[PDB]
Design a binder for this molecule. Structure first.
Ligand SMILES: Nc1ncnc2c1ncn2[C@@H]1O[C@H](COP(=O)(O)O)[C@@H](O)[C@H]1O
Ligand SMILES: Nc1ncnc2c1ncn2[C@@H]1O[C@H](COP(=O)(O)O)[C@@H](O)[C@H]1O
Lengths: 143, 143
């Protein structure tokens, strides 16, 4: 009653049935923050895949990103793109944005902890969104 | 359609009616992580005030704390106290644990952003829990 159980750390996301793979809320690189704020408050999801003109994931926009925008001492309005969050961090280049179904729980957990991020986008071979894995999903696997 | 509106940044938490002040789920410094994990998965709250023998807040235990525990390369079981999370960070000493009803939205937002934390415990004059303010609560105020 090692924590975490080693037999479950060696299992893939697919095997453990971890994540959300239906009804994914997401936005574009051309999406203004007002759109994302409306989603967060009315639709009630914790983070949003940000996809480019090809449908490929280039960022994740979270509730903390909005608060960080709100603390900026320079003047902003809500017509700023969600891509201005990229001035504060690059999940993409740090390799802490995406994951695959075949990756192990141990791998996914290490990636989350690596940059202190609360979610990863599950993608396909073309970096197109298949689903999302958040700490809540991991916790259900850790029990 | 400065974001955030200055007239709302200068208002207190009390004035804006921001936070949860009823039915707060919390744990003790003597609480094992298995207890917190059960709360997170079954009760479905995002973070837990950690209070000492006097009922004073000494930490907040979050879902990320469990994942961080799970990534530790040393051997753990679930009978570790929630206070082992304190090896990774001290919200208390950094002044990013607590807040008051009379503090401004601007103050609260800056504190969140200061340590990249997603919540603060609202306390009284004796550091006893009155409520909790999370990014979701702030977002409802930012609209
Ligand atoms: N953008 C999203 N669209 C749909 N479901 C999501 C999204 N972001 C997170 N979820 C799911 O919401 C549930 C709760 O996650 P969390 O809000 O982090 O506790 C999890 O099962 C996530 O996979
Ligand atoms: N330990 C807790 N007990 C009760 N409510 C909480 C607790 N932690 C967070 N909340 C509330 O849960 C709601 C959603 O917060 P969050 O899960 O961060 O999106 C907010 O109104 C928080 O104040």
């Amino acid at each position: 009653h090692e924590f975490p159980k080693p037999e479950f750390m060696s299992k893939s996301l697919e095997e453990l049935q971890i994540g959300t793979y239906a009804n994914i809320a997401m936005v574009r690189t051309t999406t203004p923050v007002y759109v994302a704020l409306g989603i967060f408050v009315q639709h009630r999801v914790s983070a949003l895949p940000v996809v480019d003109e090809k449908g490929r994931v280039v960022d994740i926009y979270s509730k903390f990103d909005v608060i960080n925008l709100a603390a900026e001492k320079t003047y902003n309005n809500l017509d700023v793109s969600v891509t201005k969050a990229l001035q504060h961090r690059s999940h993409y280049f740090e390799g802490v944005l995406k994951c695959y179904l075949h990756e192990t729980l141990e791998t996914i957990i290490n990636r989350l902890v690596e940059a202190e991020v609360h979610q990863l986008v599950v993608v396909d071979e073309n970096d197109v969104v298949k689903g999302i894995v958040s700490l809540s999903d991991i916790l259900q696997a850790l029990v």
